[PDB]
XYZ file of N, CA, C and O in Angstrom:
332
model
N 3.071 -4.576 -15.187
C 2.842 -5.342 -13.504
C 1.347 -4.859 -13.352
O 0.895 -3.502 -12.868
N 0.458 -6.957 -13.128
C -1.021 -5.961 -12.722
C -1.659 -5.690 -11.262
O -0.390 -5.650 -10.679
N -1.697 -4.983 -11.090
C -1.852 -3.992 -9.776
C -3.929 -4.927 -9.099
O -4.664 -4.201 -9.980
N -3.552 -5.997 -8.271
C -4.631 -6.092 -7.626
C -4.783 -5.664 -6.287
O -3.991 -6.012 -5.347
N -6.490 -5.535 -6.090
C -6.425 -4.639 -4.777
C -8.028 -5.858 -4.638
O -8.230 -6.826 -5.028
N -7.229 -6.159 -3.104
C -8.721 -7.234 -2.450
C -9.644 -6.303 -2.902
O -9.855 -4.692 -2.414
N -11.297 -7.189 -1.647
C -11.784 -6.390 -1.435
C -11.387 -5.103 -0.001
O -11.920 -4.426 -0.052
N -11.055 -5.814 0.398
C -11.298 -5.053 1.911
C -9.414 -3.683 1.350
O -10.163 -2.609 1.690
N -8.505 -3.642 0.659
C -7.561 -2.838 0.355
C -8.722 -1.712 -0.813
O -7.991 -0.462 -0.958
N -9.460 -2.288 -1.511
C -10.315 -1.654 -2.490
C -10.827 -0.253 -1.278
O -11.324 0.821 -1.822
N -11.405 -1.545 -0.784
C -12.368 -0.543 0.040
C -11.852 0.851 1.244
O -12.014 2.154 1.497
N -10.424 -0.104 1.496
C -9.705 0.630 2.768
C -8.985 2.461 1.328
O -9.650 3.269 1.484
N -8.840 2.251 0.091
C -8.615 3.353 -0.711
C -9.693 4.162 -0.906
O -9.827 5.252 -1.239
N -11.112 3.549 -1.269
C -12.302 4.376 -0.923
C -11.910 5.084 -0.797
O -13.098 6.289 -0.559
N -12.175 4.445 0.591
C -12.754 5.577 2.105
C -11.314 6.659 2.077
O -12.057 7.585 2.258
N -10.855 6.561 1.464
C -9.479 7.983 1.571
C -10.260 8.827 0.097
O -10.303 10.121 0.813
N -10.964 7.679 -0.655
C -11.044 8.623 -1.348
C -12.434 9.598 -1.309
O -12.813 11.144 -2.120
N -13.027 9.431 -0.545
C -13.929 9.965 -0.124
C -13.934 10.667 1.606
O -14.542 11.460 2.817
N -12.523 10.447 1.837
C -12.325 10.772 3.452
C -11.214 12.136 3.135
O -10.978 13.496 3.984
N -9.958 11.440 3.075
C -8.450 12.819 2.268
C -7.649 12.969 0.840
O -7.309 11.427 0.883
N -7.770 13.702 0.131
C -7.186 13.548 -1.246
C -6.226 12.932 -1.169
O -5.233 12.664 -1.720
N -5.586 13.807 -0.232
C -3.787 14.324 0.098
C -3.558 12.320 0.300
O -2.026 12.105 -0.362
N -4.197 11.153 0.804
C -3.452 9.745 1.267
C -3.913 9.385 0.320
O -3.087 8.636 0.057
N -4.953 9.695 -0.705
C -5.303 8.845 -2.156
C -3.251 9.064 -2.898
O -2.687 8.156 -3.336
N -3.148 10.531 -2.759
C -2.271 11.239 -3.720
C -0.595 9.885 -3.290
O 0.047 9.431 -3.959
N -1.000 10.257 -1.860
C 0.329 9.513 -1.354
C 0.630 7.822 -2.088
O 1.930 7.030 -1.404
N -0.475 7.035 -1.303
C -0.800 5.777 -1.960
C -0.179 5.530 -3.021
O 0.129 4.736 -3.729
N -0.595 6.886 -4.528
C -0.952 6.377 -5.630
C 1.282 6.490 -5.785
O 1.452 6.054 -7.022
N 1.833 7.176 -4.890
C 2.905 7.893 -5.289
C 3.974 6.077 -4.727
O 4.739 6.500 -5.224
N 3.175 5.658 -3.332
C 4.466 4.878 -2.988
C 3.587 3.512 -3.892
O 4.697 2.293 -4.374
N 2.074 3.486 -4.741
C 2.574 2.268 -5.735
C 3.529 2.601 -7.132
O 3.928 1.605 -7.272
N 3.188 3.589 -7.260
C 4.498 4.178 -8.348
C 5.994 3.680 -7.724
O 6.237 3.415 -9.213
N 6.495 3.928 -7.072
C 7.556 3.830 -6.750
C 7.757 2.373 -6.302
O 8.664 1.641 -6.619
N 6.891 1.591 -5.694
C 6.602 0.334 -5.751
C 7.149 -0.768 -6.428
O 8.067 -1.813 -6.917
N 6.387 -0.460 -7.894
C 6.585 -0.346 -9.304
C 7.521 -0.837 -10.050
O 8.082 -1.367 -10.050
N 8.435 0.274 -9.633
C 9.908 1.240 -9.870
C 10.788 0.218 -9.552
O 11.706 -0.893 -9.803
N 10.689 0.373 -8.067
C 11.813 -0.874 -6.793
C 11.019 -0.956 -6.291
O 10.747 -0.708 -5.167
N 10.258 -2.782 -5.850
C 9.340 -2.911 -4.885
C 9.894 -3.086 -3.779
O 8.516 -2.921 -2.543
N 10.875 -3.890 -3.363
C 11.152 -2.870 -1.917
C 12.331 -2.161 -2.052
O 13.544 -2.551 -0.909
N 12.385 -0.944 -2.330
C 13.446 0.028 -1.919
C 12.974 1.224 -2.069
O 11.184 1.151 -2.635
N 12.873 2.310 -1.522
C 12.299 3.700 -1.540
C 11.523 4.003 -0.459
O 11.420 3.967 0.754
N 10.574 4.713 -1.172
C 9.603 5.786 -0.235
C 8.680 5.037 0.964
O 8.218 3.473 0.474
N 8.601 5.444 1.872
C 7.634 4.790 3.199
C 8.549 3.877 3.330
O 7.959 3.106 4.764
N 10.272 3.827 2.991
C 11.245 2.518 3.378
C 10.680 1.526 4.227
O 10.481 0.983 5.121
N 10.004 0.507 3.372
C 9.627 -0.429 2.450
C 10.644 -1.651 3.663
O 11.773 -1.123 3.526
N 9.291 -2.065 4.968
C 9.767 -3.466 5.380
C 8.991 -4.489 5.685
O 7.795 -4.807 5.254
N 9.652 -5.789 5.591
C 9.106 -6.986 5.518
C 8.416 -7.354 7.397
O 8.441 -7.306 7.712
N 7.455 -7.933 6.406
C 6.053 -8.002 8.128
C 6.148 -9.817 8.332
O 6.942 -10.779 7.440
N 6.165 -9.933 9.184
C 6.307 -11.728 9.379
C 5.019 -12.056 9.629
O 3.768 -12.132 9.676
N 5.457 -13.576 9.688
C 4.121 -14.914 10.495
C 2.975 -14.650 9.290
O 3.116 -15.335 8.231
N 1.927 -14.502 9.980
C 0.518 -14.979 9.433
C 0.494 -13.595 7.666
O -0.180 -13.911 7.171
N 1.771 -12.373 7.837
C 1.979 -11.535 6.744
C 2.927 -11.656 6.059
O 3.979 -10.620 5.425
N 3.807 -12.497 6.789
C 4.969 -13.451 6.359
C 5.581 -13.508 4.285
O 3.716 -13.621 3.563
N 6.060 -12.592 4.017
C 5.446 -12.176 1.587
C 4.719 -11.142 2.055
O 5.218 -10.628 0.496
N 5.074 -10.127 2.937
C 4.162 -9.525 2.377
C 5.000 -8.338 3.015
O 5.985 -8.180 3.855
N 5.420 -7.148 2.277
C 5.495 -5.430 3.343
C 5.103 -4.875 3.021
O 4.212 -4.747 2.834
N 5.362 -3.463 3.571
C 4.778 -2.852 4.737
C 5.322 -1.632 4.380
O 6.905 -1.225 4.574
N 5.094 -0.417 3.874
C 5.244 1.362 3.507
C 4.345 2.132 4.375
O 3.545 1.888 4.664
N 5.102 3.610 4.392
C 4.233 4.142 5.381
C 3.583 4.845 4.626
O 3.928 5.939 4.022
N 2.706 5.788 4.759
C 1.229 6.111 4.172
C 1.324 7.383 5.260
O 1.866 8.430 4.910
N 1.312 7.317 6.921
C 1.156 7.989 7.882
C 1.945 7.263 8.768
O 2.346 5.936 8.257
N 1.962 8.583 9.941
C 2.573 7.723 11.410
C 1.294 6.483 11.739
O 2.004 5.233 12.422
N 0.377 7.006 10.649
C -0.196 5.483 11.528
C -0.852 4.404 10.628
O -1.164 2.858 10.813
N -1.214 4.446 9.245
C -1.938 4.214 8.390
C -0.976 3.542 6.978
O 0.653 4.667 7.032
N -0.629 2.370 7.101
C 0.762 1.424 6.376
C -0.066 0.886 4.687
O -1.174 0.001 4.801
N 0.583 1.233 3.554
C 0.308 -0.187 2.481
C 1.480 -1.135 2.487
O 2.635 -1.052 2.509
N 0.297 -2.149 2.294
C 1.259 -3.306 2.366
C 0.169 -4.259 1.420
O -0.640 -4.351 0.888
N 1.775 -4.956 0.939
C 1.696 -5.302 -0.508
C 2.482 -6.883 -0.880
O 3.425 -6.651 -0.055
N 2.570 -7.801 -1.760
C 2.492 -8.193 -1.915
C 3.986 -8.111 -3.371
O 2.543 -8.020 -4.500
N 4.219 -8.769 -4.036
C 4.987 -8.231 -4.878
C 5.514 -10.044 -6.466
O 5.941 -10.622 -4.894
N 4.684 -10.774 -7.278
C 5.417 -11.645 -7.903
C 5.965 -11.251 -8.865
O 6.265 -10.469 -8.876
N 5.702 -12.314 -10.187
C 6.707 -12.005 -11.026
C 6.655 -10.963 -11.951
O 6.678 -9.978 -12.835
N 4.948 -10.433 -11.833
C 4.490 -9.906 -13.048
C 2.984 -8.870 -12.199
O 2.545 -8.283 -13.563
N 2.549 -9.502 -10.895
C 2.208 -8.440 -9.886
C 2.598 -8.314 -9.006
O 2.967 -7.787 -8.050
N 1.320 -7.085 -8.611
C 1.601 -5.874 -7.150
C 0.294 -6.014 -6.501
O -0.836 -5.643 -6.923
N 0.309 -6.967 -5.601
C -0.957 -6.979 -4.288
C -0.893 -6.060 -3.238
O -0.051 -5.943 -3.035
N -1.973 -5.323 -3.404
C -2.205 -4.865 -2.566
C -3.581 -5.977 -1.223
O -4.273 -5.195 -1.495
N -2.320 -5.481 0.046
C -3.700 -6.363 1.174
C -4.067 -5.356 1.556
O -5.240 -5.688 2.357
N -4.033 -3.744 1.726
C -3.782 -2.649 2.442
C -3.730 -1.809 2.186
O -2.277 -0.942 2.001
N -4.101 -0.524 2.993
C -3.774 0.442 2.570
C -4.612 2.122 3.642
O -4.548 3.069 3.658
N -4.624 0.940 4.739
C -5.617 2.044 5.708
C -5.186 0.697 7.396
O -5.410 -0.617 7.314
N -5.045 1.568 8.300
C -5.324 1.151 9.418
C -3.433 0.691 9.839
O -2.733 0.653 8.407
N -2.484 -0.425 10.489
C -1.343 -0.828 10.806
C -1.244 -2.127 10.934
O -0.707 -2.683 10.081
């Protein structure tokens, strides 16, 4: 499954790499779990609505969420910072 980052989400990830390695590891753990079971597991995956319909969200922290979308063979990361 291809892992796709937008310019914005890669920026979010780089921010964590230079801000808090714990968050980087959590995001990696969530990506790994999502690859295994896209809509089940860690971070309590839940569907977003309207403008973000089709995207799902998992909790990184009580403030930051991993927002993503899954296709037949790709995991799209829309964001991993903010809510």
